[PDB]
């Protein structure tokens, strides 16, 4: 076994590699959304900047899992990053709804990983997810939920424009 | 009688205890409203912050009456703080209308207390209410009246959103 | 279900509402104690300030649970805040003994909630209690235990006076 | 009548002159107490400084009434300042008890004056007493009550010494 390895189950190591790919995928989805909102026929800079930031964060989430894998003595095994489901993401409301669904899918993956680790008494994995992932996910889901509500409140047209200016700067 | 007591009628002492409970109740109503506007399906941060501030102020009003009771040699007798009438508070307009009605009820209580004290020539009580309560109430009622008018002016939807951004930050 | 809700059991949501009321109750007990020590015939300013601070903290604990409920997509349901058991709290020693017993009761409630969440694999709830509540409770219980010991050490009269000056400023 | 005089009853003018003498008397009592605590066989510097400050305040109270009399167009008529009842004032506790009784006597005089003015609709007198005298009296009475309680708590000897050091610096 590798020099560091201790109390690190093979299925947790595999779950870390799975989560790495999922975070990279989420980064790619948000990158697609960011540049969609930079199109001349969409042209919402606040949405552009919001999803650019979300993409950067997801890449950070992936890198922190790469670091984690090596710290525990696991081995990083990368997979293809699939292209997103769509090339175009609709209105600001529709993109926020996609983001919310994506974040709940990532959250379920993280909770599943936590449960695998708990079955193996992997308290270090537990701590890592609690300190860096689970509350970050809940905060992201609540933020996006709030945005969906307000994009419904303001409506299309001038409403979407003002939300981009006032809620997303 | 207690060491400080002088020119302090029993019914004024009782009225101070009644007002303490009413201020604590008002604090609790505003706390309920504040966190209602933090719900993911309501999501108006300016309303949230406004009612959070109003709740904190009411708690201050109650504590200042607790201090007053002891300064005069009365004795604080606390009662239960009843839960608010509702769990959910409707639109921004509807919540402001509830707040306005609440503040006029608190004002009537304070004016009633002033009248009790005046009948007993309790100039210190008079001063305390004039310096700390009566103009504060009138200012609160005028502010909320102005907000009700403007929430009617702007209308639902984008209007409520913009009022939250521009009048309540 | 609400937009955010994920891995959030109904009995955890209910337990959060129960804890909200308990924290508000504790706040009210400490507020009663604070103003008791401001009475002219008690007149211990350090005890007054200590319990004032404890009351403010408990209100913070309650608000953080209100925020938590909304972040998870639960719904806040407020109950009456019962008046404390007593109007008068005895010596400094006796009040500290009441506070210690109260904090151990709040701690047991929090540990019970942790156990409910653990049965539902609610790692986010676990994290929230570990980060914000459980060590805060242990620290509070140890502090109050230390104060009880020292109030017994110094004795009544000048001892209580000096403890108020030197341990509570 | 004098150039300023308006809505100023003769019995209010006389009551102002009476209050002037009472404030000067209180100043003299506190001056006697201050220098008693500077005696080599008493030697409590905190009590000395406390009563020195109280004497200075009372002189300020008298001067503000002298100014008031002239502002309303009344005429100041000074009377003898009687020597205090005692040359020696006993323990710290006993002096604080004398001070408390004195302040309640001054308060009753002020409340009597307020009542005279109210019968004459003298709102300016009312305001003057509310702004400068009545709450100042209540605060003084509460402070002295608190000190009496604590001087009983600490007891004679080392207790009195420590109260002088810790409560009166
Ligand atoms: Cl675990
Ligand atoms: Cl009046
Ligand atoms: Cl757990
Ligand atoms: Cl009047
Ligand atoms: Zn396994
Ligand atoms: Zn850009
Ligand atoms: Zn962010
Ligand atoms: Zn993050
Ligand atoms: Zn992520
Ligand atoms: Zn492919
Ligand atoms: Zn994410
Ligand atoms: Zn753990
Ligand atoms: Zn865990
Ligand atoms: Zn870390
Ligand atoms: Zn703008
Ligand atoms: Zn009456
Ligand atoms: Zn807030
Ligand atoms: Zn305000
Ligand atoms: Zn106020
Ligand atoms: Zn109020
Ligand atoms: Zn009830
Ligand atoms: Zn109010
Ligand atoms: Zn008045
Ligand atoms: Zn009045
Ligand atoms: Zn005041
Ligand atoms: Zn704007
Ligand atoms: Zn359960
Ligand atoms: Zn205080
Ligand atoms: Zn503390
Ligand atoms: Zn705390
Ligand atoms: Zn607490
Ligand atoms: Zn009850
Ligand atoms: Zn506590
Ligand atoms: Zn945990
Ligand atoms: Zn746990
Ligand atoms: Zn943890
Ligand atoms: Zn936190
Ligand atoms: Zn000391
Ligand atoms: Zn008259
Ligand atoms: Zn001196
Ligand atoms: Zn002073
Ligand atoms: Zn003064
Ligand atoms: Zn005076
Ligand atoms: Zn004489
Ligand atoms: Zn005085
Ligand atoms: Zn007046
Ligand atoms: Zn008056
Ligand atoms: Zn003035
Ligand atoms: Zn010392």
- DSSP conformational letter for D77: -
> Ligand 3 centre from A118 Cα, in Å?
9
- Nearest chain B CA: its distance from D80 CA (Å): 28
| B81 DSSP β-pair partners | C81
Q: Is D76 helix (H, G, I), strand (E, B) or coil?
A: coil
HSE at residue D25, side-chain half, CA atoms within 13 A, is 21
CA distance A75 to A124: 17
HSE at residue B97, side-chain half, CA atoms within 13 A, is 9
| Distance separating the N- and C-terminal Cα atoms of chain A | 51
Distances (CA, A) of C86 to B15, B69, B128, C81: 20, 17, 28, 14
State both tokens at D62: 């008298």
Per-domain boundaries in chain C: 1-169
CA distance B126 to B132: 10
- The DSSP annotation for C110-135 comes to HHHHHHHHHHTT-HHHHHHHIIIIIH
Of 3.40.50.300, 3.40.50.720, 1.20.1260.10, 1.10.3720.10, which CATH number belongs to C1-169? 1.20.1260.10
CA distance A17 to A76: 6
Q: CA B25 from chain center: how many Å?
A: 8
CB atoms within 10 A of CB B143: 15
Distances (CA, A) of B34 to B48, B49, B144, C77: 4, 7, 15, 13
Residue with tokens 């200075």: D56
Residue with tokens 């500077």: D38
- DSSP conformational letter for D157: T
| Distance separating the N- and C-terminal Cα atoms of chain D | 51
Q: Return the H-helix or E-strand segment holding B17.
A: helix B10-36
State both tokens at C89: 């709290």
SS (H, E, C) chain A: CCCCCCCCCHHHHHHHHHHHHHHHHHHHHHHHHHHHCCCCCCCCHHHHHHHHHHHHHHHHHHHHHHHHHHHHCCCCCCCCCCCCCCCCCCCHHHHHHHHHHHHHHHHHHHHHHHHHHHHCCCHHHHHHHHHHHHHHHHHHHHHHHHHHHHHHHHCCCHHHHHHHHHCCC
- Taking a C-beta distance cutoff of 8 angstroms, is the pair D92, D73 a contact? no
Closest CA to A95 of A53, A138, A36, A39: A36
Least distant ligand from the CA of C124:
34
Contacts of residue C135, defined as CB under 8 A and 6 or more positions apart, other chains included, come to none
Maximum CA pair distance of chain C? 61
Closest CA to C29 of C52, C62, C60: C52
CA distance A142 to A144: 6
Binary contact (C39, B84; C-beta < 8 A)? no
B131 chain-D contacts, CB cut-off 8 A: 130
Closest CA to C96 of C9, C165, C162, C29: C29
Q: How many residues does chain B have?
A: 169
Burial class (CB in 10 A: 0-12, 13-18, 19+), A21: middle
Name the residue among B40, B69, B76 with its Cβ closest to that of C4.
B40
- Find the angle CA(A108)-CA(A47)-CA(A52) to the nearest 5 degrees: 65
Closest CA to D29 of D78, D79, D87: D87
CA distance C125 to D71: 69
- The DSSP annotation for B122-156 comes to -HHHHHHHIIIIIHHHHHHHHHHHHHHHHHHHH-S
CA distance C35 to B64: 11
Binary contact (B4, D129; C-beta < 8 A)? no
CA distance B56 to B27: 7
Distances (CA, A) of C142 to B54, B150, C96, C101: 35, 53, 12, 12
Contacts of residue C165, defined as CB under 8 A and 6 or more positions apart, other chains included, come to C46, D166
CA distance C144 to C135: 14
Distances (CA, A) of A92 to A33, A53, A98, A157: 10, 16, 10, 10
CA distance C70 to B33: 13
Instruction: Tell me whether residue D124 is annotated as binding.
Output: no
- Taking a C-beta distance cutoff of 8 angstroms, is the pair A66, A27 a contact? no
- Taking a C-beta distance cutoff of 8 angstroms, is the pair B43, A150 a contact? yes
Q: State the helix-helix crossing angle for C158-166 and C135-154, rounded to 10 degrees.
A: 140
Q: CA B125 from chain center: how many Å?
A: 19
D149 chain-C contacts, CB cut-off 8 A: 40-43
**Cα Rg of chain B, angstroms:** 18
Residue with tokens 């109650």: B62
Closest CA to D129 of D104, D108, D143, D111: D111
Helices assigned H by DSSP within chain D? 10-36, 45-72, 92-119, 123-129, 135-154, 158-166
CA distance D34 to C6: 72
Interface of C to B at Cβ within 8 Å reads 2-4, 24, 28, 31-32, 35-36, 38-41, 59, 63, 66-67, 69-70, 73, 75-84, 87
CA distance B133 to B127: 10
- Taking a C-beta distance cutoff of 8 angstroms, is the pair C23, C58 a contact? yes
Closest CA to A13 of A77, A62, A106, A105: A77
Contacts of residue C22, defined as CB under 8 A and 6 or more positions apart, other chains included, come to C106, C109
Q: Is B167 helix (H, G, I), strand (E, B) or coil?
A: coil
- A89-98 burial, b for 16+ CB within 10 Å, e for fewer? beebbebbbb
State both tokens at B45: 């941060």
- Taking a C-beta distance cutoff of 8 angstroms, is the pair B46, B164 a contact? yes
Q: State the Cα torsion D108-D109-D112-D116 to the nearest 10°.
A: -170
Burial class (CB in 10 A: 0-12, 13-18, 19+), D67: exposed
State both tokens at D129: 């007493």
State both tokens at A91: 């209105």
| Distance separating the N- and C-terminal Cα atoms of chain B | 51
- DSSP conformational letter for B81: B
State both tokens at D40: 């080599």
CA distance D2 to C165: 56
State both tokens at D152: 């009983």
- Taking a C-beta distance cutoff of 8 angstroms, is the pair B54, C16 a contact? no
Burial class (CB in 10 A: 0-12, 13-18, 19+), D80: exposed
CA distance B92 to B160: 7
- Taking a C-beta distance cutoff of 8 angstroms, is the pair B124, B72 a contact? yes
Q: State the helix-helix crossing angle for B45-72 and B92-119, rounded to 10 degrees.
A: 10
> Which is it for the CA torsion D150, D153, D155, D161, positive or negative?
negative
Mutate to test the interface with C, among D154, D158, D168, D169 (most CBs of C within 10 A): D154
Contacts of residue C129, defined as CB under 8 A and 6 or more positions apart, other chains included, come to C110, C113, C114, C117
State both tokens at A80: 């293809």
> Which is it for the CA torsion A124, A128, A131, A137, positive or negative?
negative
Closest CA to D140 of A122, B71, B6: B71
Q: Is D121 helix (H, G, I), strand (E, B) or coil?
A: coil
CA distance D131 to D112: 16
Binary contact (C83, B78; C-beta < 8 A)? yes
CA distance A96 to B93: 27
CA distance C153 to C93: 10
- Taking a C-beta distance cutoff of 8 angstroms, is the pair D125, D119 a contact? no
CA distance C75 to B41: 11
> Ligand 31 centre from A154 Cα, in Å?
39
> Residue C81: what are its φ and ψ, rounded to 5°?
-100, 105
CA distance B18 to D23: 36
CA distance C163 to C92: 9
Binary contact (B6, D139; C-beta < 8 A)? no
- The DSSP annotation for C48-93 comes to HHHHHHHHHHHHHHHHHHHHHHHHHT-------BPPPS-S---SHH
- Find the angle CA(D12)-CA(D17)-CA(D18) to the nearest 5 degrees: 90
- C94-126 burial, b for 16+ CB within 10 Å, e for fewer? ebbbbbbebbeebbebbeebbebbeeebbbbbb
Burial class (CB in 10 A: 0-12, 13-18, 19+), A66: middle
Instruction: Tell me whether residue B124 is annotated as binding.
Output: no
CA distance A114 to A125: 7
Distances (CA, A) of C4 to A146, C57, C155: 9, 28, 55
> Residue A85: what are its φ and ψ, rounded to 5°?
-70, -25
Mutate to test the interface with B, among A103, A149, A157 (most CBs of B within 10 A): A149
CA distance C96 to D136: 33
Q: Is B3 helix (H, G, I), strand (E, B) or coil?
A: coil
Q: CA C132 from chain center: how many Å?
A: 12
Binary contact (C165, D163; C-beta < 8 A)? no
CA distance A166 to A46: 9
């Amino acid at each position: 076994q590798t020099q560091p390895r201790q109390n690190y189950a093979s299925d947790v190591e595999a779950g870390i590699n799975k989560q790495i790919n999922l975070e990279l995928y989420a980064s790619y989805v948000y990158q697609s959304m960011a540049w969609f909102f930079d199109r001349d026929d969409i042209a919402l800079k606040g949405f552009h900047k919001f999803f650019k930031h979300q993409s950067e964060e997801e890449r950070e989430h992936a890198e922190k899992l790469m670091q984690y894998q090596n710290k525990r003595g696991g081995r990083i095994v990368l997979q293809d990053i699939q292209k997103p489901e769509r090339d175009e993401w609709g209105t600001g409301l529709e993109a926020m709804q996609v983001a919310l669904a994506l974040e709940k899918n990532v959250n379920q993956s993280l909770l599943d990983l936590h449960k695998v680790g708990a079955g193996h008494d992997d308290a270090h994995l537990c701590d890592f997810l609690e300190e860096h992932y689970l509350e970050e996910q809940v905060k992201s889901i609540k933020e996006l939920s709030d945005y969906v509500t307000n994009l419904k409140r303001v409506g299309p047209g001038l409403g979407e424009y003002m939300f981009d200016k006032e809620s997303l700067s």
